[PDB]
């Protein structure tokens, strides 16, 4: 598998050609042979924000001891040479009637970090339900009370600390919630440097072995860019080869369609080169 420098030569060479973009367009969005059954059942159709963004049966997230369906997928990115696995749950922006299941996932797995890569609305249309209350209010979702204890806006994202109370048992759990608001659907981040800083910030907030919950509107486009970038950061820092196409394929084997547009792939490939060359010593 060659080396970081070699893979980086090939990537910059291939961006010039550009074979890297041709090979992206050739890649399947949906892995052939992977069953998608539960997502299309009558009771589940309106639990999908988009008709064509559905979880595979093999990687779909199940609620513990609870039959309710949710459009969410486990996505794990391995870096074998580093004995490292970065775990994610990739999901859509909740609908009004899916907030209960979203918070159940957070509770089940005591997830401490949610990364939301969308605004609530775009162009007068709702892209994600507001599944948390404006402080100081308290919301009930499916027998979870949710309150926002802290809310602070930076340039490009909002940082919120949320308290989740299980009303059945009286137990509570705290979650950090990062909402990246400067990144429109089917496009690239408004500022590349804000994006790279945000990814590295997310990396720093990981808790050992705990998946990061990541969502956008569909949970594949902007989410796929973020996952690709975190993977690449880990690889560059360890002097290991980076093949973006292998990374996208690996995500797509776990949730169809990750990285929605060619423009997004080109963005992430360029950002990978940028980070490599910024960090390069000699």
């Amino acid at each position: 598998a060659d080396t970081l420098e070699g893979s980086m030569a090939q990537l910059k060479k291939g961006l010039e050609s550009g074979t890297v973009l041709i090979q992206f367009e050739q890649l399947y969005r949906k892995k052939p042979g992977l069953a998608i059954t539960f997502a299309k059942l009558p009771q589940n159709l309106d639990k999908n924000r988009y008709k064509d963004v559905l979880p595979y049966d093999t990687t779909r997230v199940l609620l513990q001891g609870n039959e309710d369906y949710i459009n969410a997928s486990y996505v794990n990115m391995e870096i074998p040479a580093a004995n490292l696995v970065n775990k994610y749950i990739a999901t859509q922006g909740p609908l009004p009637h899916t907030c209960a299941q979203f918070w159940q996932v957070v509770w089940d797995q005591k997830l401490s970090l949610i990364v939301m890569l969308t605004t609530l609305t775009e162009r007068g249309r709702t892209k994600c339900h507001q599944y948390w209350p404006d402080p100081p209010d308290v919301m009930n979702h499916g027998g979870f009370h949710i309150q926002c204890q802290s809310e602070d806006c930076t340039i490009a994202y909002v940082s919120r600390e949320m308290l989740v109370t299980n009303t059945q048992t009286g137990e509570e759990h705290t979650v950090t919630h990062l909402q990246y608001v400067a990144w429109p659907a089917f496009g690239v981040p408004d500022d590349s440097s804000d994006f790279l800083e945000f990814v590295n910030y997310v990396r720093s907030l990981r808790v050992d072995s705990e998946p990061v919950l990541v969502h956008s509107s569909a949970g594949i486009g902007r989410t796929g860019v973020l996952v690709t970038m975190e993977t690449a950061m880990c690889l560059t820092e360890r002097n290991l080869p980076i093949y973006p196409l292998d990374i996208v394929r690996k995500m797509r084997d776990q949730r169809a369609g990750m990285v929605q547009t060619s423009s997004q792939y080109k963005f992430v490939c360029e950002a990978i080169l940028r980070v490599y060359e910024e960090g390069l010593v000699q």
């Binding site: 159709l45 309106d46 999908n48 988009y50 008709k51 064509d52 963004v53 162009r123 659907a185 089917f186 509107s217 569909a218 594949i220 486009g221 369609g257 929605q260 547009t261």
Partner: peptide, 8 residues
Amino acid sequence: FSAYPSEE
């Protein structure tokens, strides 16, 4: 039910 848009 709608597909995930890639345009306006």
